[PDB]
PDB file of C-alpha atoms in Angstrom:
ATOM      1  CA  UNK A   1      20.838 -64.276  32.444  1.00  0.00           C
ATOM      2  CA  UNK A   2      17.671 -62.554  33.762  1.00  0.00           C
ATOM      3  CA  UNK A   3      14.284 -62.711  31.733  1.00  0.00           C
ATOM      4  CA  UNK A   4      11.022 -61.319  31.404  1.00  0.00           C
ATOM      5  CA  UNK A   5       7.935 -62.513  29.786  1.00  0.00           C
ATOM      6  CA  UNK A   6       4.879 -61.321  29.522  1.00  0.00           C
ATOM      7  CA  UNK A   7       1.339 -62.728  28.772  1.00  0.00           C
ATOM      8  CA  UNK A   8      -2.267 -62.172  27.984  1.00  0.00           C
ATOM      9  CA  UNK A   9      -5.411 -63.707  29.445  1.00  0.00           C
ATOM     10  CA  UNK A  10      -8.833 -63.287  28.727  1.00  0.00           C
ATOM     11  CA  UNK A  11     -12.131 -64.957  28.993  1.00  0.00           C
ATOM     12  CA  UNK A  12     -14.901 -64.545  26.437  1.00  0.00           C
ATOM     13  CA  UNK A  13     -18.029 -65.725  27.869  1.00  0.00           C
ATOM     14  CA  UNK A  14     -20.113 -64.577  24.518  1.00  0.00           C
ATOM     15  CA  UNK A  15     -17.968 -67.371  22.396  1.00  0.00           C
ATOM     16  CA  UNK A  16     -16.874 -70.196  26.060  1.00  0.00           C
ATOM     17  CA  UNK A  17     -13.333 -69.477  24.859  1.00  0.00           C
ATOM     18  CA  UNK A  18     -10.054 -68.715  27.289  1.00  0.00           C
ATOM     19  CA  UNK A  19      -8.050 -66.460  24.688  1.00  0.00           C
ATOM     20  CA  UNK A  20      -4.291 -66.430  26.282  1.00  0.00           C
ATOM     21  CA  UNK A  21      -0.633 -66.249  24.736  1.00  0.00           C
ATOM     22  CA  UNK A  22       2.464 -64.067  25.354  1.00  0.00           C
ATOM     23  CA  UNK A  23       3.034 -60.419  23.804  1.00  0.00           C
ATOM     24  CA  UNK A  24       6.395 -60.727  21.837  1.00  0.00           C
ATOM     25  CA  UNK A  25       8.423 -58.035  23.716  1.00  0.00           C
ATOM     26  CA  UNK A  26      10.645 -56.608  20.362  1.00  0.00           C
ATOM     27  CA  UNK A  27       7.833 -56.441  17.866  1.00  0.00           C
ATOM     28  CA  UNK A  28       4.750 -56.133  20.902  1.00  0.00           C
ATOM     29  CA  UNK A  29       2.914 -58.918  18.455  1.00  0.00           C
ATOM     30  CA  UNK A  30       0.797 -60.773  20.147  1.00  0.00           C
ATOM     31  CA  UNK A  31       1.276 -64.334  19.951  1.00  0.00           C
ATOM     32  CA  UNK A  32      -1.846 -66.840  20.691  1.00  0.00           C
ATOM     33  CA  UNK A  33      -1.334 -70.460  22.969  1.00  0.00           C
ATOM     34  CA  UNK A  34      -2.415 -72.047  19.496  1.00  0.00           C
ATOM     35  CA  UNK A  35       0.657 -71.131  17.552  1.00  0.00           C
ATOM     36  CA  UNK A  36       3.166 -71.835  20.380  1.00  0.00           C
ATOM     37  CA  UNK A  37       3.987 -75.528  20.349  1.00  0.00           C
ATOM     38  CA  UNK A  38       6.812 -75.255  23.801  1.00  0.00           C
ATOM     39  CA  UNK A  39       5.042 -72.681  25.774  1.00  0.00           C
ATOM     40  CA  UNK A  40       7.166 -72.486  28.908  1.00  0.00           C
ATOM     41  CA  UNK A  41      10.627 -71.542  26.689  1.00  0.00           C
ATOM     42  CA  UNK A  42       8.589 -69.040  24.475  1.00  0.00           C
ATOM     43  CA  UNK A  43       8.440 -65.151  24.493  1.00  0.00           C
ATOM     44  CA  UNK A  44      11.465 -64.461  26.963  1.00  0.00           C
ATOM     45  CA  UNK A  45      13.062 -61.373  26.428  1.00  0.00           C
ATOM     46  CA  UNK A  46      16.660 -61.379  28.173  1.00  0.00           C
ATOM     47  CA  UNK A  47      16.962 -58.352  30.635  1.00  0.00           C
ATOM     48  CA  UNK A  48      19.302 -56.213  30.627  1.00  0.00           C
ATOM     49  CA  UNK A  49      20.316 -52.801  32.250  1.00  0.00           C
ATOM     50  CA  UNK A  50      19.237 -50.624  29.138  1.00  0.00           C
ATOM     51  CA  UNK A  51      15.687 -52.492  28.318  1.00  0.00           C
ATOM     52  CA  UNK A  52      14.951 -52.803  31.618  1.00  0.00           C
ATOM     53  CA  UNK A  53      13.176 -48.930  31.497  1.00  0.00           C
ATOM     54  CA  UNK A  54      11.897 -49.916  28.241  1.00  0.00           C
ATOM     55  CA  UNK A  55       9.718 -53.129  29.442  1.00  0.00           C
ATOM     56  CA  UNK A  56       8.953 -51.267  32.497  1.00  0.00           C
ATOM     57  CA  UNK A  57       7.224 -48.466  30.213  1.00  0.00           C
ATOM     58  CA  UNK A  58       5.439 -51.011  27.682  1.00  0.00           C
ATOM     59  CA  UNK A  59       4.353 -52.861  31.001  1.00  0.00           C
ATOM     60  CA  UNK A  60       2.923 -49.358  32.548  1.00  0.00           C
ATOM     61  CA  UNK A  61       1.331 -48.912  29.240  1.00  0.00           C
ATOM     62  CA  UNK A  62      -0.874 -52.101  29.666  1.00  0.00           C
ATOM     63  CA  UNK A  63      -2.240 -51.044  33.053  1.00  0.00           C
ATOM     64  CA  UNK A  64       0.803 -53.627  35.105  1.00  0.00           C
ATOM     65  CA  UNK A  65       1.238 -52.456  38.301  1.00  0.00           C
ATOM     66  CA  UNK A  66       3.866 -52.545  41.482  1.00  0.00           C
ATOM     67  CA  UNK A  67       3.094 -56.162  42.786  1.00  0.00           C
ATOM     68  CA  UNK A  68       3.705 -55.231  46.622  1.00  0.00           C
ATOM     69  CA  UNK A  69       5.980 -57.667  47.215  1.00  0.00           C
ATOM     70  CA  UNK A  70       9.174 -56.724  49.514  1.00  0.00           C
ATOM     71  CA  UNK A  71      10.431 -60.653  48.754  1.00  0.00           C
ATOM     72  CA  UNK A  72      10.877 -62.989  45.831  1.00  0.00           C
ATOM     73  CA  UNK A  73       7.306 -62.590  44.451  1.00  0.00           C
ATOM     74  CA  UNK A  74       8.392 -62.462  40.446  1.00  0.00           C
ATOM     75  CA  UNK A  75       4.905 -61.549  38.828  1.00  0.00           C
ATOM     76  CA  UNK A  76       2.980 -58.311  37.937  1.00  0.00           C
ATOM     77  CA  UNK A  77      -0.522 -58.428  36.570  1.00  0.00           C
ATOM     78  CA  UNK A  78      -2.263 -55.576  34.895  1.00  0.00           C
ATOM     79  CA  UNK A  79      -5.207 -53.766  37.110  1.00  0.00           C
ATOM     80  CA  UNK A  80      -7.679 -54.993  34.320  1.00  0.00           C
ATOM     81  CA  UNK A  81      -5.974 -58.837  34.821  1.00  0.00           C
ATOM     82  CA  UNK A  82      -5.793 -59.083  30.861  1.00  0.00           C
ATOM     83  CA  UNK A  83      -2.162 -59.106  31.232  1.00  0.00           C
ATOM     84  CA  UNK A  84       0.976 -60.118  33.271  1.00  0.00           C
ATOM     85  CA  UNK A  85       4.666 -59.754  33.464  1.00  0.00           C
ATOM     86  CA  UNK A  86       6.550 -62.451  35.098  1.00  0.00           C
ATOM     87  CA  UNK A  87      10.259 -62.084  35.930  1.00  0.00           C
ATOM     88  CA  UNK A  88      12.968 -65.306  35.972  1.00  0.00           C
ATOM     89  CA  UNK A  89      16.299 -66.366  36.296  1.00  0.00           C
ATOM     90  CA  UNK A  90      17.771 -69.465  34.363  1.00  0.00           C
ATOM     91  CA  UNK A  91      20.700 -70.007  37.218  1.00  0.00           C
ATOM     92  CA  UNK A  92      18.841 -69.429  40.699  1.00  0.00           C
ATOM     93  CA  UNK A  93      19.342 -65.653  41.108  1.00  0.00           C
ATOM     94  CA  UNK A  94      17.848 -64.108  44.250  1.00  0.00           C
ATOM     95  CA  UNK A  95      15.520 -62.126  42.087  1.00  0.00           C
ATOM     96  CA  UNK A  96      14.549 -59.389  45.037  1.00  0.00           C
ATOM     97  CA  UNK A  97      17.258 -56.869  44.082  1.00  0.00           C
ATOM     98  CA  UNK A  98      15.794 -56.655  40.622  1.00  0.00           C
ATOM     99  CA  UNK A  99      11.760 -56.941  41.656  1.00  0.00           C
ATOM    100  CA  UNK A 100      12.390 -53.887  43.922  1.00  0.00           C
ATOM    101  CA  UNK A 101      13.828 -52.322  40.530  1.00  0.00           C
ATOM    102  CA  UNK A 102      10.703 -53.332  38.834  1.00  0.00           C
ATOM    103  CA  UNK A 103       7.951 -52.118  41.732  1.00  0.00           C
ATOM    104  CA  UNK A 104       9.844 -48.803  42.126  1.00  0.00           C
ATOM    105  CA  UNK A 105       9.738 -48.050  38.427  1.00  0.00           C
ATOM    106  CA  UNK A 106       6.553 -49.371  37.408  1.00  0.00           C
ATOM    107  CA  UNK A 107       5.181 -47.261  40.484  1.00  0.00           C
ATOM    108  CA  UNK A 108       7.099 -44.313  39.449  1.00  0.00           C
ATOM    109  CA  UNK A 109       5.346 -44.817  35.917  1.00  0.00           C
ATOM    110  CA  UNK A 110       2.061 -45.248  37.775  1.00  0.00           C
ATOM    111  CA  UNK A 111       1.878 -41.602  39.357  1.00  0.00           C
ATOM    112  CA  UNK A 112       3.251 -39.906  35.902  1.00  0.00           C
ATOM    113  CA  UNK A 113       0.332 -40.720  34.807  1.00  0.00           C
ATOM    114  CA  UNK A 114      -1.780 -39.939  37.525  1.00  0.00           C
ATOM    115  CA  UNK A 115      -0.081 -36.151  37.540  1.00  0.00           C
ATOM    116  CA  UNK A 116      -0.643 -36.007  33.554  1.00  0.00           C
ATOM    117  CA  UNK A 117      -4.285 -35.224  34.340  1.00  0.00           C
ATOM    118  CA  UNK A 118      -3.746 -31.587  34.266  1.00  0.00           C
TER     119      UNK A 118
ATOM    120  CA  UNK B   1       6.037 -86.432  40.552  1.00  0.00           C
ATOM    121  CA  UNK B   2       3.508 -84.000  39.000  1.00  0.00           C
ATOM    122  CA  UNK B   3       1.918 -81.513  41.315  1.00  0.00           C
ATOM    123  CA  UNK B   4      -0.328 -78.867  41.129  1.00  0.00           C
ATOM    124  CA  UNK B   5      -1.088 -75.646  42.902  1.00  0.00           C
ATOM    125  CA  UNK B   6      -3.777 -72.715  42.926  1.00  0.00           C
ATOM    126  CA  UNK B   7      -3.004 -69.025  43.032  1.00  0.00           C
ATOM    127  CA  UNK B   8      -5.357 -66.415  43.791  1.00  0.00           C
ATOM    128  CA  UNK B   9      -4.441 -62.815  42.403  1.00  0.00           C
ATOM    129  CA  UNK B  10      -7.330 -59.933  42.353  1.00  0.00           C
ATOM    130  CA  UNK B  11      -7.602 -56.133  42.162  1.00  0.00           C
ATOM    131  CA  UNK B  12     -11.017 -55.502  43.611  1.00  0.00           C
ATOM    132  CA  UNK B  13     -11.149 -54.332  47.205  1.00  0.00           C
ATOM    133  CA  UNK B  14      -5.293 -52.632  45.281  1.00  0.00           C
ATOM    134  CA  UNK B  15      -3.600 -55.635  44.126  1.00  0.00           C
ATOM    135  CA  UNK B  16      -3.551 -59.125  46.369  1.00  0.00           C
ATOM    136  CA  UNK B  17      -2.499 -62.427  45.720  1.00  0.00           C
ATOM    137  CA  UNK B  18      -1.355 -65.407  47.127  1.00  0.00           C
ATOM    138  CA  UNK B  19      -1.657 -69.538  47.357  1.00  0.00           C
ATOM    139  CA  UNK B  20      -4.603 -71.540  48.254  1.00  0.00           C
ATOM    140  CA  UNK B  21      -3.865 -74.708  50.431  1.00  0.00           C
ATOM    141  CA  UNK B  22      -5.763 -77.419  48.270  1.00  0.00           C
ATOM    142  CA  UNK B  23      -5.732 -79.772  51.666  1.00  0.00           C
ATOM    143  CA  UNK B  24      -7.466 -77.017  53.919  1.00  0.00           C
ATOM    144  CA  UNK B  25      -8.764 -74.521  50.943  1.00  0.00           C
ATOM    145  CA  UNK B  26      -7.325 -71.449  53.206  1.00  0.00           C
ATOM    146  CA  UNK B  27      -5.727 -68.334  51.285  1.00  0.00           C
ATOM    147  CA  UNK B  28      -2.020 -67.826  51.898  1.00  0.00           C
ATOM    148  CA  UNK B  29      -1.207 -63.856  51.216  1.00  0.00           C
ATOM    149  CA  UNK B  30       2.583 -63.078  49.458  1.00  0.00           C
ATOM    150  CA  UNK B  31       3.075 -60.835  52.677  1.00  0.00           C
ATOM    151  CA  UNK B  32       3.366 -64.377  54.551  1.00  0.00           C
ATOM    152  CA  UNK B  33       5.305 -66.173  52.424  1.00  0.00           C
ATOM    153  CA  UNK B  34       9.083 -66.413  52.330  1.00  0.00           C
ATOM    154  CA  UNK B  35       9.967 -69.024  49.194  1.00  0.00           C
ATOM    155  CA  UNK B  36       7.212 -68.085  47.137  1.00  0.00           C
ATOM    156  CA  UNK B  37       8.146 -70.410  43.944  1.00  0.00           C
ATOM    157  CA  UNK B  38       8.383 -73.265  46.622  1.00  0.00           C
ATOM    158  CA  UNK B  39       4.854 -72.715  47.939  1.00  0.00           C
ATOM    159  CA  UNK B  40       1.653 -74.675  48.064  1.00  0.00           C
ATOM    160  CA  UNK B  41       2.272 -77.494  45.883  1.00  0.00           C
ATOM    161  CA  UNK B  42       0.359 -80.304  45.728  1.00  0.00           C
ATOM    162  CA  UNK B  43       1.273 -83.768  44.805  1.00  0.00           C
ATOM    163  CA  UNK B  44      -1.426 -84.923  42.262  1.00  0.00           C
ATOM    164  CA  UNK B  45      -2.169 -88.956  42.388  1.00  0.00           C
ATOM    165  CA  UNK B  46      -4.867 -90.519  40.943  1.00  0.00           C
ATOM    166  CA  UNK B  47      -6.959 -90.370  44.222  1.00  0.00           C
ATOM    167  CA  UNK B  48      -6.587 -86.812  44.319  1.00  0.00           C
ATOM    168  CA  UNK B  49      -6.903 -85.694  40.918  1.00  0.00           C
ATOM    169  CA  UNK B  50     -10.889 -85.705  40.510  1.00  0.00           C
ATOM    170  CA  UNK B  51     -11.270 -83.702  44.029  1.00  0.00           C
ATOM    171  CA  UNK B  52      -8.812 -80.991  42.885  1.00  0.00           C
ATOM    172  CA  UNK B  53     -10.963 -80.480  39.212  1.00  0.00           C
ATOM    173  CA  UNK B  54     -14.231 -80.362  41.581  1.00  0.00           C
ATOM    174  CA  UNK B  55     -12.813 -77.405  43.761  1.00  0.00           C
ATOM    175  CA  UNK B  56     -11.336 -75.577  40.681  1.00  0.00           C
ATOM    176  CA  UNK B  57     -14.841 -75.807  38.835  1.00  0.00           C
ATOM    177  CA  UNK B  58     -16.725 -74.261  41.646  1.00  0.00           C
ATOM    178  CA  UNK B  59     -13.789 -70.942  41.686  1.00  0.00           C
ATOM    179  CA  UNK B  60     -14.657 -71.191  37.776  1.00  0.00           C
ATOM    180  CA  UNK B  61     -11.640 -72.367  36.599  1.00  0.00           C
ATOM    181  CA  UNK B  62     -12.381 -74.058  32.994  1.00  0.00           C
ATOM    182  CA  UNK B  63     -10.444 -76.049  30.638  1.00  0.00           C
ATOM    183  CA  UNK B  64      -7.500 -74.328  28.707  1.00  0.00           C
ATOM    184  CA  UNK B  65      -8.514 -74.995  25.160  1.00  0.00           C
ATOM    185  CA  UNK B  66      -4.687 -76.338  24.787  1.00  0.00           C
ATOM    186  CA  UNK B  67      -3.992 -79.115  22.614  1.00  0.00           C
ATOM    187  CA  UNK B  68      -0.630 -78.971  23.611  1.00  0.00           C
ATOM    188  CA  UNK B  69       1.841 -78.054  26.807  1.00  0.00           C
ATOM    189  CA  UNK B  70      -0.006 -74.869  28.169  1.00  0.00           C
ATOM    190  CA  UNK B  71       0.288 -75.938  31.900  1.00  0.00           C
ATOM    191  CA  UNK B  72      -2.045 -73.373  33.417  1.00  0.00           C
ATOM    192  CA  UNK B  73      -5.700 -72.723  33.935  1.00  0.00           C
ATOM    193  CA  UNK B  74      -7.588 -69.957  34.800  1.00  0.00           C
ATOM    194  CA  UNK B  75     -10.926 -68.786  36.133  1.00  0.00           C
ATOM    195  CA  UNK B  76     -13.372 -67.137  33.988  1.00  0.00           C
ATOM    196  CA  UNK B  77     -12.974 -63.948  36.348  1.00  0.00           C
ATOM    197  CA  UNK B  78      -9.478 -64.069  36.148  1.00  0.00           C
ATOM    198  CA  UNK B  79      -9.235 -64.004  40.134  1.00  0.00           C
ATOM    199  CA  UNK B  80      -7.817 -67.801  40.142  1.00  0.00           C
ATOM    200  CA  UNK B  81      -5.120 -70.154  38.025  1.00  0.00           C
ATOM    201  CA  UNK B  82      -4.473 -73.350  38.962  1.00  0.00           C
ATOM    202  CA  UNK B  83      -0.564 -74.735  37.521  1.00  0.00           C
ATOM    203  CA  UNK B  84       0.504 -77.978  37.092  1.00  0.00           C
ATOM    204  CA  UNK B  85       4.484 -78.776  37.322  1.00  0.00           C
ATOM    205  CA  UNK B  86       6.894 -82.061  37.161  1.00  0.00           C
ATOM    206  CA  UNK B  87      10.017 -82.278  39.220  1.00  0.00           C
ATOM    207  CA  UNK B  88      11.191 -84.720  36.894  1.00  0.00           C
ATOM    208  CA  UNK B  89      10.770 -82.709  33.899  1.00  0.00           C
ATOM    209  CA  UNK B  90       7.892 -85.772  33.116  1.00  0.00           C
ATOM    210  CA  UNK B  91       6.132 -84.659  29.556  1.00  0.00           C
ATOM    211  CA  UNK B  92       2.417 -83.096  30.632  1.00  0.00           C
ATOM    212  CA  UNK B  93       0.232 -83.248  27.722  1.00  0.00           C
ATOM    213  CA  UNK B  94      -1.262 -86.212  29.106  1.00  0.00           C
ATOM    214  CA  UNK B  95      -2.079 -84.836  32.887  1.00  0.00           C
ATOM    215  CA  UNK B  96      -3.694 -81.470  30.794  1.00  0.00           C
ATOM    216  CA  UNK B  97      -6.101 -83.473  28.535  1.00  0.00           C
ATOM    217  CA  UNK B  98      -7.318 -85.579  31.687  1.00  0.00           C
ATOM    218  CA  UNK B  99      -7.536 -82.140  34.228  1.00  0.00           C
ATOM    219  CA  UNK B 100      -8.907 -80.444  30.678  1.00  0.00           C
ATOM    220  CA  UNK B 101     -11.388 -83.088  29.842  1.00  0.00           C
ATOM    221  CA  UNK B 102     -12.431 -83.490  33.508  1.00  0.00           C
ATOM    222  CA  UNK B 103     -13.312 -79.687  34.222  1.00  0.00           C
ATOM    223  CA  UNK B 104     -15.638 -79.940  30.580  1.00  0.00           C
ATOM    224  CA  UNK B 105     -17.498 -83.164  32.195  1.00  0.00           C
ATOM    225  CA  UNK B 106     -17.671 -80.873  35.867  1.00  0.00           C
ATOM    226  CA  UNK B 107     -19.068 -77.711  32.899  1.00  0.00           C
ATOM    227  CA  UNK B 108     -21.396 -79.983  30.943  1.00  0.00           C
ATOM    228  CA  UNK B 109     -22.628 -80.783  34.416  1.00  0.00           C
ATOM    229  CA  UNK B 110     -23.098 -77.249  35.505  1.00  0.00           C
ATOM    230  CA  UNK B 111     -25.312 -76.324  32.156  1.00  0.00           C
ATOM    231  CA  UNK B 112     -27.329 -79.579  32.896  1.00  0.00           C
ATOM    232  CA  UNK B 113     -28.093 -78.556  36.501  1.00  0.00           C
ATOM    233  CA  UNK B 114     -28.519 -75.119  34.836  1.00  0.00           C
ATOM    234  CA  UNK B 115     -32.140 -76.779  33.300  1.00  0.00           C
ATOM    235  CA  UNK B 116     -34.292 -77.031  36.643  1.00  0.00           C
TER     236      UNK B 116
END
């Protein structure tokens, strides 16, 4: 079973304070590192053939971007770094099939919006 | 066995990231790395511990504000995270409030320096 998760990351220098937590992928709610109590199982979303546009589009939304990678690299970060998306499997996958899926979508979202300034 | 590791990810220059050695501080790009999740880890001792908080603190990486399991910590510029991982699935919240207490001491330093 493949999943997706993806997080925010900020740093407010005005108030010292890191301000991080995952984005709930159903309801897009926000969810802060203070009200998650086991942080590494939280706020996966299991992928699946039909969502997969759907988290791609979200992601695209937030500024995430093709990662480059032609291996196993599982992560895309947003060009602002607020956010990322990471990618895992819970049974050892070789994850490069669907990270190709991922770089050639979100960069297919990336130029849509570059021609949509017309 | 705990260990940690540093990643370096960035826009400024088109998007680049990678792993930085903590033995030889030298930047490791994905395009030359093959097992990426296997990468760059560091086994963290008690002899090594305080060196890896004082290289951390000068990228800018500051404690998490966690009180609980949040494994990760970032720079203030977002361009570096440092993670810390068992093998043994050991519990962590002990290893974050020492590497979380010791980059405050390695702040309070900073702002104390920051006072001619």
């Amino acid at each position: 079973m493949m999943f997706v998760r993806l997080s925010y990351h900020s740093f407010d220098y005005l108030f010292n304070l890191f301000d991080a937590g995952v984005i709930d992928l159903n309801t897009k709610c926000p969810v802060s590192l203070s009200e998650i109590e086991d942080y590494d199982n939280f706020g996966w979303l299991e992928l699946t053939a039909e969502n997969l546009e759907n988290v791609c589009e979200y992601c695209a939304k937030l500024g995430i971007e093709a990662n480059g990678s032609l291996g196993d690299f599982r992560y895309w970060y947003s060009g602002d770094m607020s956010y990322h998306l990471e990618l895992k499997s819970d049974q050892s996958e070789n994850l490069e099939v669907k990270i190709r899926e991922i770089n050639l979508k979100l960069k297919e979202l990336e130029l849509i919006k570059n021609e949509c300034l017309e």
